[PDB]
Amino acid sequence: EEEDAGLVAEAEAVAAGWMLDFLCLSLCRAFRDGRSEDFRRTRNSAEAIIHGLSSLTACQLRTIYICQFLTRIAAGKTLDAQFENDERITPLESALMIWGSIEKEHDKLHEEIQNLIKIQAIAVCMENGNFKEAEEVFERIFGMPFKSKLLMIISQKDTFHSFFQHFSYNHMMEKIKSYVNYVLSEKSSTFLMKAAAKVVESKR
Amino acid sequence: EEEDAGLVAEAEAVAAGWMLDFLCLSLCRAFRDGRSEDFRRTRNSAEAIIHGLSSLTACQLRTIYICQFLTRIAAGKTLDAQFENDERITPLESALMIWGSIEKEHDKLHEEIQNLIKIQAIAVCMENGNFKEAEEVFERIFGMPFKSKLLMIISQKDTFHSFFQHFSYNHMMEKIKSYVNYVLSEKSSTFLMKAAAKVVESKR
Ligand SMILES: CCc1ccc(OCC(=O)N2CCCCC2)cc1
Ligand SMILES: CCc1ccc(OCC(=O)N2CCCCC2)cc1
Numbered sequence: 001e002e003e004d005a006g007l008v009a010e011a012e013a014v015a016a017g018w019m020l021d022f023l024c025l026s027l028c029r030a031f032r033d034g035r036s037e038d039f040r041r042t043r044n045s046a047e048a049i050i051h052g053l054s055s056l057t058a059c060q061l062r063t064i065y066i067c068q069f070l071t072r073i074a075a076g077k078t079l080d081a082q083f084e085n086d087e088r089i090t091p092l093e094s095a096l097m098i099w100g101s102i103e104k105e106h107d108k109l110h111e112e113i114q115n116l117i118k119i120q121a122i123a124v125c126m127e128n129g130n131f132k133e134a135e136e137v138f139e140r141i142f143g144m145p146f147k148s149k150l151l152m153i154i155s156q157k158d159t160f161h162s163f164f165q166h167f168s169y170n171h172m173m174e175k176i177k178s179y180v181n182y183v184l185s186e187k188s189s190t191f192l193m194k195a196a197a198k199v200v201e202s203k204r
Numbered sequence: 205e206e207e208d209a210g211l212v213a214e215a216e217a218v219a220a221g222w223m224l225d226f227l228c229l230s231l232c233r234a235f236r237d238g239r240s241e242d243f244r245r246t247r248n249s250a251e252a253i254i255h256g257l258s259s260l261t262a263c264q265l266r267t268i269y270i271c272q273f274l275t276r277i278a279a280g281k282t283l284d285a286q287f288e289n290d291e292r293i294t295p296l297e298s299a300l301m302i303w304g305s306i307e308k309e310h311d312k313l314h315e316e317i318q319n320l321i322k323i324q325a326i327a328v329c330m331e332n333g334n335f336k337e338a339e340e341v342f343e344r345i346f347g348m349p350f351k352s353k354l355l356m357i358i359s360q361k362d363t364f365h366s367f368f369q370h371f372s373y374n375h376m377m378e379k380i381k382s383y384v385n386y387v388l389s390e391k392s393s394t395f396l397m398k399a400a401a402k403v404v405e406s407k408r
């Protein structure tokens with residue numbers, strides 16, 4: 001009776017792990033495709049499954065970090081969203097913290113995404129007329145030539161500066177989608193998706 | 205590209221169906237065991253997965269009805285919970301509506317559970333001092349000898365009447381748990397649980 005209960009709990013943990021990988025893959029695909037409503041609904045399912053998991057492997061923590069990173073990027077222009085206990089941290093600042101914590105290679109693409117999130121974290125404040133908040137985000141992030149241009153734009157209150165058009169929100173999204181394509185290729189072979197794909201193929 | 209997107213969506217529907225059955229089995233087990241917090245967390249996961257499913261088979265609708273029925277029974281004493289668009293309907297009345305909609309045999313146990321939910325739907329109002337609400341629940345449900353005793357208890361404001369101790373909330377819960385055991389036996393062979401169980405067994 002107690003051994004049965006324990007074996008059932010172990011099986012529920014195995015199934016939750018399979019469900020987390022599948023939901024991460026669905027979330028990545030919705031982000032890549034721009035399917036806003038599917039992303040919202042999948043994020044809700046991923047959060048609920050995560051609250052039912054206790055012990056995590058290094059791989060499951062990385063998968064969770066990727067889900068959290070994409071959620072903050074999707075909410076990057078929503079300055080009323082509070083993702084951290086410190087209410088001053090903006091969504092792109094929260095995405096930057098996660099980006100620097102994921103156990104992943106620090107290749108050229110990693111650094112390009114990092115710097116585009118930093119510029120846009122300031123740009124989104126400027127675009128909403130939040131000039132003092134842009135200065136505070138700048139101080140938290142920066143924590144020389146790149147830093148100096150940003151402080152100049154902030155002090156001029158140059159909301160639609162040409163610098164923000166060369167390192168735009170769309171360019172940040174496109175670089176992030178390139179990274180998402182690599183996660184989709186790596187997780188396409190996860191148990192639930194493979195089994196579901198085999199079922200669909202066998203009926204064709 | 206469009207055929208690939210369509211095949212991916214079909215696989216996501218297959219996986220969501222497997223996830224719904226697994227979450228129903230986990231929800232049933234938490235209800236049977238009295239694991240209140242696991243029931244709450246599993247209900248959250250089941251609701252989110254359900255919102256990501258569009259077309260349902262007759263079997264999936266029955267599985268969803270069972271999840272909804274157990275949620276209303278678990279909230280039976282929570283008279284501030286509103287499960288229907290009509291705010292007057294109490295949680296046990298909402299459970300009674302679902303019980304009469306499930307495609308299932310109407311054996312002796314089905315009717316015993318039905319009548320215990322009817323008595324308790326009135327009993328829970330009386331126990332909270334809501335005498336006028338008990339009369340209104342009575343009129344919505346009833347909709348001869350059984351009906352007459354209840355109307356007499358309601359009019360006397362006999363909160364802790366002996367009739368409610370013979371057909372108690374605990375007796376209703378125990379009869380419902382007997383039914384839950386049959387659902388657990390029928391869904392223990394679902395894809396995700398079987399595969400998870402095989403993994404756990406292979407490591408023993
Ligand atoms: C957006 C997806 C999401 C993910 C997790 C979460 O809460 C849990 C949480 O933060 N951790 C921290 C990381 C390890 C798991 C527990 C809420 C929402
Ligand atoms: C408690 C579990 C739960 C289940 C379903 C749900 O909403 C969806 C809903 O009602 N239907 C009606 C029945 C068919 C699916 C759509 C909310 C919570």
Ligand SMILES: [Ca+2]
Pocket residue numbers: 079080081
């Ligand atoms: Ca804010």
Ligand SMILES: [Ca+2]
Pocket residue numbers: 283284285
């Ligand atoms: Ca009420």
